[PDB]
From a paper:
Chlorothricin (CHL) belongs to a spirotetronate antibiotic family produced by Streptomyces antibioticus that inhibits pyruvate carboxylase and malate dehydrogenase. A previous study reported that ChlB3 is involved in the conversion of 6-methylsalicyl-S-ChlB1-ACP to 6-methylsalicyl-S-ChlB2 with catalytic efficiency kcat/Km = 1690.70 mM−1 min−1. ChlB3 is a dimer having the same active sites as CerJ (a structural homologous enzyme) and uses a KSIII-like fold to work as an acyltransferase. Structural comparison indicated that ChlB3 belongs to FabH family and showed 0.6–2.5 Å root mean square deviation (RMSD) with structural homologous enzymes.
In the current study, the crystal structure of ChlB3 was solved at 3.1 Å-resolution and a catalytic mechanism was proposed on the basis of conserved residues of structurally related enzymes. The protein structure was present in the space group of P212121 with four dimers per asymmetric unit. The refined model of ChlB3 contained 334 residues in each monomer and no electron density was observed for its 197–201 and 227–230 residues. ChlB3 structure is organized as a homodimer and each monomer having its own active site. Each ChlB3 monomer has a seven-layered core composed of two layers of helices interspersed by five layers of sheet, with several connecting loop regions around the core. The core region features an internal duplication of two segments (14–183 and 184–339) that are comparable in structure except at their loop regions, although there is no major sequence similarity between the two halves. A total of 2627.6 Å area is buried in the dimer interface of ChlB3 protein. The main chains of Thr205, Arg215, Gly112, Ala185, Arg239, Gln110, Gln92, Gln90, Gly102, Asp103, Trp89, Gly85 and Glu190 are involved in hydrogen bonding at the monomer-monomer interface. Generally, in KSIII enzymes cystine is responsible for the transacylation process, although histidine and aspartic acid catalytic residues crucial for Claisen-like condensation. ChlB3 catalytic triad (Cys113, His296 and Asp301) as shown in Figure 2C, significantly differs in electrostatic character and geometry, despite the catalytic cysteine (Cys113) occupying the same position as those seen in both structurally related enzymes. The volume of active site cavity, as calculated by the program CASTp 3.0, was 934 Å3.
Residue numbers in the entry:
A (entry chain A): 4 to 196, 202 to 224, 229 to 346
B (entry chain B): 4 to 197, 202 to 225, 230 to 346
């Protein structure tokens, strides 16, 4: 059973450059030289559920799909969306999809989009013949317990939202394969407390520093690098292609050094084939870095018929997910 | 394709009585007489991921399953688990399942278990022939920003965890059907009057529901909820291939007797003896574990034997209305 991507959409607010951040004293001058970043998309007071609604509407309106025809809604995120005891997917269920679908919030850090693609693809295959599913990501890091500039090491957090409409019937693109491996031994990399949940602020740099200070074996990082290449080898094998067939690579919007060494230099591909130039100005958009990169490559016409995109992403777990999207025809909105 | 329940497991800490709560001044005497609840399961400083790890291991060890053969892990929850920027399923991934599965956190209030059963059933059907999936729920409502006694109207929150092991191959029970309808017009019931800022304030569903009734009393939202409550039960029974007469027991949430009787049992036209209220009232509302822990208790004690059916009914944020039917084929391999 084939799973086709009918359409994709996003919402990106106004970008704040690093030169501005350096002047006010939010971002460091040395870090601006160390990480050659462009900027970060800042929403401000716009809720993340609203940003997801804008991205979902564009994806639906692009291909001319009916919101009621959807059989699944997967809202993914890595940070608080709204009030506690209330999930964000009901907002899209009210103002778009309708209450005759399976709406459910996914959470797996920045790799939540990859897991949603697996669950959505499995849901469509098991379901009826004419099926369709909506997968969306959205986050607003402009909050009290999150500093977009200094929280994450090697990247600047950004606000926005990504969307994608999967379907059983033929479309412009096709999801060939998508995997998700993990190194659970390095699960302490993204924490350092578990008795009391909320209260303290977020800072991945200190949590990574605390994890690096003490390890039982400490061959986690190397097994993480092994499992980075393993999941890519597995995804390409399932998709039925080689690394030579890959046209572009969609890694997260981390520092130029990190994107070069960990992703592109590991696979043995040039930095021109990455989505770094575009991604640098946007920053790390939670779990929307590869779908917004796919959107930009598809919409502009850089990724034409016959080409393959290699979506890769490492997140908390540490979980390493890889996906392969093939463009069959040109997009109906380009 | 048939989706069988291989086994089920749970964890329930020491139950604090309602009479104790009235003496200390946490729970009012009026609500004690009105709701007629027994008590609530209270964990001290035990994390919810640990509580899920107990329930997961129990369900796995009961049927003699090996954790690595699982092809899916669905961790569901209604409230915070641990540190932010870190999901709880990785804890079970290290100390049980392993990093060769699709681990992912589900969130849909108290009906998150029902949605996980749909996604797990669909994942097993679409996947290979021999398959198995672990679905688990776990929550700890022990403050700061959550008063277990006064937060929820008509129910006392309780700590614990519920587990269930789905599979393609034959088992002791069978998941006949499971669905989830929603009335998105009443999504502001649990939101109330505050969206821009995410955190800082405490959770209090009574004031959130109270604020919604002012907005409602200024479209027929509540009648739609009551309509779609009976609709999802009708369609789940129709999908399962049975009638309401075939239902032996019913598993509703552990809310007050007045709520459990009127909204669920009186609505379906069944007696309160057929509910799981006598057992559930002691434990309280276990986030999204009320129906599976009720499934567990009925299975191991021998009250729900071969040929019987269990009608799991839920109502959560959305407002989402989920219903499921579980048929016991043979006696459990662990009782």
């Amino acid at each position: 059973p084939d799973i086709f991507i009918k359409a994709t959409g996003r919402f990106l607010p106004e970008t704040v450059s690093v030169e501005w951040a350096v002047e006010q004293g939010h971002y460091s001058a040395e870090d601006a030289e160390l990480h050659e970043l462009g900027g970060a998309a800042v929403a401000g007071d716009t809720p993340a559920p609203d940003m997801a609604l804008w991205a979902a509407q564009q994806a639906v309106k692009r291909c001319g799909h009916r919101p009621e025809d959807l059989g699944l809604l997967l809202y993914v995120d890595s940070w608080h969306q709204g009030p506690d005891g209330w999930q964000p997917q009901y907002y899209l269920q009210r103002h778009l999809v309708g209450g005759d679908v399976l709406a459910v919030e996914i959470q797996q850090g920045c790799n939540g989009m990859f897991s949603a693609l697996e669950l959505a693809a499995a849901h469509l295959r098991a379901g009826p013949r004419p099926g369709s599913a909506l997968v969306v990501a959205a986050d607003n890091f402009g909050t009290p317990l999150f500093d977009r500039w200094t929280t994450g090491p090697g990247y600047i957090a950004g606000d926005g939202a990504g969307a994608v409409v999967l379907t059983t019937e033929p479309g412009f693109a096709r999801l060939l394969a998508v995997r998700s491996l993990a190194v659970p031994e390095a699960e302490q990399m993204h924490r350092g407390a578990p008795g009391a949940t909320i209260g303290r602020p977020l800072n991945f740099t200190s949590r990574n520093a605390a994890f690096r200070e003490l390890s039982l074996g400490t061959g986690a990082l190397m097994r993480v690098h092994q499992r980075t290449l393993e999941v890519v080898e597995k995804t390409l094998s399932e998709a039925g292609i080689t690394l030579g067939d890959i046209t572009r690579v969609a890694y997260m919007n981390f520092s130029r050094e990190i994107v070069e060494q960990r992703c592109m230099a590991a696979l043995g591909l040039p930095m021109s084939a990455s989505t770094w130039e575009f991604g640098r100005k946007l920053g790390h958009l939670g779990a929307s870095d590869q779908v917004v990169a796919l959107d930009e490559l598809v919409t502009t016409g850089e990724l034409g018929p016959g080409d393959h995109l290699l979506m890769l992403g490492m997140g908390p777990g540490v979980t390493l997910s890889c996906a392969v999207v093939k463009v069959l025809t040109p997009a109906p909105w380009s």
